[PDB]
Amino acid sequence: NNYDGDTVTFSPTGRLFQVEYALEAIKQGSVTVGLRSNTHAVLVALKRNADELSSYQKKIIKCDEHMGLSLAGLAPDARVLSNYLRQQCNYSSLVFNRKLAVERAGHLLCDKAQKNTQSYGGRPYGVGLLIIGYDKSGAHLLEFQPSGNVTELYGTAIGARSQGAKTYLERTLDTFIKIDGNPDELIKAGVEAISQSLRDESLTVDNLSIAIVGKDTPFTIYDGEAVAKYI
Amino acid sequence: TTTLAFRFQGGIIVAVNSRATAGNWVASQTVKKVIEINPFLLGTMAGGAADCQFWETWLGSQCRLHELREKERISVAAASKILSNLVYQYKGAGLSMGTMICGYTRKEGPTIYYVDSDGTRLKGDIFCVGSGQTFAYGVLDSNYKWDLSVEDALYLGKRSILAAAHRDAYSGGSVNLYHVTEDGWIYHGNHDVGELFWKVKEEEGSFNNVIG
Amino acid sequence: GYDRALSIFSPDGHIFQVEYALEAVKRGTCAVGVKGKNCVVLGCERRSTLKLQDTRITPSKVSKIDSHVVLSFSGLNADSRILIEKARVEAQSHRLTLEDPVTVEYLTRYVAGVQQRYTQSGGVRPFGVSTLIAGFDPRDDEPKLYQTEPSGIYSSWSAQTIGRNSKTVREFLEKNYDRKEPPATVEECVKLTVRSLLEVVQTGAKNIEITVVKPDSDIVALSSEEINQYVTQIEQEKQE
Amino acid sequence: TQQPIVTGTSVISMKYDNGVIIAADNLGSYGSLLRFNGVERLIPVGDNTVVGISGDISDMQHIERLLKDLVTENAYDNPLADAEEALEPSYIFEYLATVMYQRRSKMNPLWNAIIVAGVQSNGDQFLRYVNLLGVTYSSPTLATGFGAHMANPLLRKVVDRESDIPKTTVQVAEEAIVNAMRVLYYRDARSSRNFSLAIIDKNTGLTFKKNLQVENMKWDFAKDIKGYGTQKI
Amino acid sequence: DRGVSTFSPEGRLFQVEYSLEAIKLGSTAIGIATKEGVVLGVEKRATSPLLESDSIEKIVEIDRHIGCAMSGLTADARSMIEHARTAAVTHNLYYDEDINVESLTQSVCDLALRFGELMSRPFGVALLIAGHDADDGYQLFHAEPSGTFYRYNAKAIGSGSEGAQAELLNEWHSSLTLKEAELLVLKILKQVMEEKLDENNAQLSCITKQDGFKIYDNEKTAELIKELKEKEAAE
Amino acid sequence: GSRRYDSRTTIFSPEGRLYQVEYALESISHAGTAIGIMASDGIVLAAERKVTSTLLEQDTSTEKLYKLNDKIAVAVAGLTADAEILINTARIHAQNYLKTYNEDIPVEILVRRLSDIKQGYTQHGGLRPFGVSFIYAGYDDRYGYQLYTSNPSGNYTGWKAISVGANTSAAQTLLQMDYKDDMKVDDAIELALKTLSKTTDSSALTYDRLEFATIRKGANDGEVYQKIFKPQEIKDILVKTGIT
Amino acid sequence: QFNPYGDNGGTILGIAGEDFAVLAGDTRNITDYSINSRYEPKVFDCGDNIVMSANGFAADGDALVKRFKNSVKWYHFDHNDKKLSINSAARNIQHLLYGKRFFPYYVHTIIAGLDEDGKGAVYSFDPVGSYEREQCRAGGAAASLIMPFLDNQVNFKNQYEPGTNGKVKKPLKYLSVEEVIKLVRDSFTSATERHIQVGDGLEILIVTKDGVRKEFYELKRD
Amino acid sequence: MDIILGIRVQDSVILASSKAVTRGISVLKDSDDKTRQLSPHTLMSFAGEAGDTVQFAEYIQANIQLYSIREDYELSPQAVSSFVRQELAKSIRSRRPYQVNVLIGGYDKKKNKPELYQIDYLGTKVELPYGAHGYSGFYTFSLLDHHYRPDMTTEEGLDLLKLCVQELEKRMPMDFKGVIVKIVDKDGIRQVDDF
């Protein structure tokens, strides 16, 4: 009310309203799902269009050969954060000849988002990210929120009506976690998960967007006729 | 290097060799020393290979940006001055460039500008630049007239490079010819000195110093 | 440094600071530009609440940017000096690098660009000035007349007016100016410019300034007596 | 622009079937003066890497601090700091190699020659060289300073190419290293008798040996040598 | 007052949303993409009859293979075009090739959100960026001040956008010829424009692989307008 | 942040006016009146000191009239402190010109630059404008004798006779009435004093409440002299014109 | 005074065929009269069917290759995974080299691959960025020994048709991958014999439309 | 760049400047104009380091032309010379100084007098009846000391100038390919085409 003019102001109950309004931008965004087993990690994203004449907004971005994310909310803010991740992954390779740990990737994003919530003039990032990767400690899935909070999970979903897919994964937890050495089945579980967040619309060939990374699989994105298999 | 370009009745002739040296080591015999900036503008290259090659391709980008912004092809004077003002900023840093900006526009007509790395910029009808420039001057000056035909002018430019290619140790390889008219530049082929020298010697009856 | 975003959008999609800068232009003394077949004429109003003035030394309303281009304006006088100075510097800088004087379009584009930069730069307000830029391109005999405004938009005009009561004089020019046949001579172009100002001014004494620009850097300012002859001629023909 | 003041001489090393061996004497020379005798020039990083450094000792001590700080930094927010996400020899080397080249590019080098010896997580032997110029190279045997001229020839008789590595045991490899250290004591004027030796094995891990001495030296034949030509007495 | 980069309770940037209202006040611009080329057309909208309409430059060349149309506060587009042209030429200098239409659009859209308390406010202009490259062929992009860009088969921006967009929905198909697309832009422009459409108050342009980006003459457009009127009366 | 406390000094009103400039002019309208009158053979500067106290040291005082160089002087109306900042800048600018061209600065060039500085404070920087209006009186070999005025907006204009500060409306009417072009300095001196005497808010105009200065060519042959009047010299000129 | 440059020796060789291109280089690394390594590769697969080698001062060479490899990576990110053509790579390398015009990379750089028509391509650079496409180029310590032999055998220079009175030249033709590798191996064995900085091993990288293949051969170790 | 001369007579200033541009063992051009018009009644000739000369001359030209537009008034030769001197005086203590020597010939319209100023690259200004830069002075000064009179006409000044050029052509080592002569007077600047 009087305490939402900027990010530098606390409310009487100890809330940061600008950070909360940034969180609201994610809820308006199109749904995206993340899940992993022990061998592979998968991102599934429902892309959104302006109208029938327009293209479908790309949700998934590659950061390195072994890491990448999906976005929900302000896409330009995802471009800034993904670019930062690309540089940090790259710094780790050039300087230490070392693939960046997915956990450090999360810590770095947390710290970058935080600085924008404590200073005058700036604003919080208006996007939520699901980071997947495969490093020296196996497969990983992270959920980034622009408050700064980063959380490692087996599976999750963010965006509009993400609660449906999140409930499904909470039921399916014991099943999909053990899908080891089988990419297509892990994707199927993710495609069935995102389907619990659909209303009136269904998954079409230029609507669905899938990405995967794993033990002997570089981070690759599938769009167009390459996802027709999973409909 | 040896490069020349002269102005005449039928426009501009531009001729250059194709040798690159690193001391006495002949590094290449097939270097393109003419840069094609646009259908109406040419640039010759002598001195430091990288300096010339880098900054004249950069010049072409600046000429493209001019015609986008101004909806009109850049003048030869303006183009040459962009390059001369650039190298002047680097004066003393050790750039080595002896270039000639040749072209045609409506307002200027056929125009040649000599531009070098110590900031000199000169408009003129005849210029020879490079380690064998004096050898090219010798033949070019003694045979030059304004009323040369397009056929005779092309040959004189070719013959002048050949003269330098022969005498100057750091010149040779092959001759590249260009003719610039009101309609733009026209390429007139690559001519290897290996075959061209003997062809010229036999037909012209010159080069009597050499064992035939 | 002072960073405040002064020019910003409002809910209805307007930038009030830019629009309020236009109100400052509307307050300013009237300025008119009319281009003929072989010339352009810049007319300017001077308010007559100021007597005891020294017209020798008082800044003139029309300013030379180069020997071939002139700039008149309406709005804040102090603001206009800053634009004129920048334009004059850019004119000499163009001659130095391109070895050719500016076109009227280029000079207008530069001035307009400066005005625009002040509409989305932090810590500054927009120029409370609209300009009429007129002249002839190098080695060209086609007359040029451009207009700029605080927002930064610019465009070419066969004839145009800016300042206070400009909507009245624009109304006059819209019916009196023929596109198919513009003022064929200098006299015809000056007369139409004076006529248009006489719809608004008050008296044709020391209230009207006229400046004529012709090809190949031929610019001259008319004196009181010269202008008064046009005023005397128009009034006698009016009584009919 | 520097000049080295207090210096350390040769660092020698080689690969064997299960790991790597590295050695360097304990001397800190001050020109011709053999100033400091208790200087450790082999610095372990974790339980799987040993960095041997020659050249300027002040710059060596700077590098020690950097490596020490690198271990601390790696431990931050890293639950697997003593497991999967522990520091590898290849990580430690590439970091140093980056620093060495950056410093030479700023015309202010760390006046050193460095050999990073270790064993990777997958069991592979790691042995690579880097110096003040940022120049890097790897080989079955690596040595700095006089070691390059005198040790390498001896160590290459044992492991002349890649295929000789599995055929070379830790006993044979250490024997060659210790012999090389004796030869350097005979012939390098800025060397000492006391030295340190480190073995990094993929099975038995890191073994760091201090206070070793050159022994079994041949000096007896000196008594027979009289004069410089003619002299009989 | 309030911060420039502030979020509303609904999760949108106030200034970005307000700049969109400015774009709705702007003159209409329409783009249609075909397999034979991309067509760009705009409403000039002269504020007075004395204004020489040919000086109204709302269609613009970025490179030989990329063109651009604008709508809204058109003065704001000048620095965007300048950036686009430099980006296009710079990429040619670094890589000896034409730059992808999408990469060009992304470069322009990076400027969009570089405002706050960088420039003082968002751009008050939308752009239709049309072009061709070897990889993705003929393309049409809509670049907003939000930093977002969508690819479109056809798109209208400006005051008559929602009415024109609904018309483009019905009329567009994947087998449209270039000539058919030209007439379709003129047809839809004439429907949404206030004043009567002619060669002086409306401008056409196109980009083809063969001839590159070309703005049409008033003589050429006039014939297409005459051809359009005859075809509508023919049934 | 700090946005809350920003007055926004450099913005337009809905009517297209600069708030701070208008309010600065309102401030100046309460300052002691200053008059400049330009004659054919010289210039007069007259100014009324702000409600003087009897214990004020009058002879070693400078409030209204300041010297910029040997050929140019100014009369001040508004905040004195603000004026002195601008005066020192103007003095430096005149010396820069002399150093560069080996010629005394033309009056208008000095006036323009000082007025450009004032303009800057209205368009950028976020600072309050200078609450000062000047009357410039000076000579050069191009235009001869010149009078200018500048105000917080940074706009300047040339004059034959002009008043700034308080009661300018009434003062300008009186000057417009009795001024003529073939006027001499001695006549202009009389006009300046008579005008102040009628427009003053004081009971009677006295020597101790005035500052006076002339710029004549009254020196020996083709050279300009600046005379800043002493208290006794003002007392004499006041008696000589029959005011006291 | 500190000297930031050094000479790591070695030599490299690039030949272009009709539908292939090879880039060879010896594996010896040296300083002064000492051998540092008998196998230290300096020919690298950089992706997009581009092979590269920067011979001379190894530290600068490694830095350059590292930076170009990184340039390829970012080219994919910024331009929708578009394949970097050999001609585009060459121009990009010029800007890398010239970027340090006043503190140069002391290296002779050669890249090889296929042009956009599928034909073999070799580009060669000087230390400050001047570049040229060629059928043939040797670089490094033994370049002066190898290059004239290549002129004679690859481009058939100074060879005339027998019996034609030195009037008709020997006609130019593309060589097979088999014939090219013969010339590479003979060039390096000859260079090894007469140059002290060349020897130990030879590593050849062959580039066709199918990918990048490797071949290794022993060289004299003296 | 080598020979630049200047002679102030009764009613005009005459500037003579060599036409040769030499680089190495080659005369690249023999028709070079080593002068710029700063204003309608002010002309500056120049000589010195390659590149610097023209860059400096044009920079001064632009500044004077900017002044003329701003004030709608022509600066006096004295004022222009002082401005030029200051620029050179700044330059000499810069990171890379302009190595340019100049002569400024002008006609002061207010005084109705011709004026010749000699300024070297250090910023050393002198007003003179006759001036030269470089090795030219070592011949011409003694010659002008003898033959020069203050009340000479423009035609007498040209004959006096011909005498200098002849002496230089006789005793100078280098071939400077003759001179371009320009006259500055009350009617402005004009070039003598046949010299």
Ligand SMILES: *[C@@](C)(CO)[C@](*)(O)[C@H](CC(C)C)NC(=O)[C@H](Cc1ccccc1)NC(=O)[C@H](CC(C)C)NC(=O)[C@H](CCc1ccccc1)NC(=O)CN1CCOCC1
């Ligand atoms: C005639 C043909 C010869 O003088 C012309 O003047 C030509 C102009 C053409 C090439 C555009 N000039 C040259 O051929 C020119 C001569 C030269 C040499 C060095 C400096 C300036 C001018 N040659 C070059 O520039 C060569 C190009 C080679 C053939 C690839 N390059 C070099 O000499 C390079 C880079 C020079 C350089 C300049 C500034 C800073 C650093 C380097 N130098 C080396 O290759 C060094 N060297 C060669 C042998 O291998 C071991 C190291």
Ligand SMILES: [Mg+2]
């Ligand atoms: Mg050998």
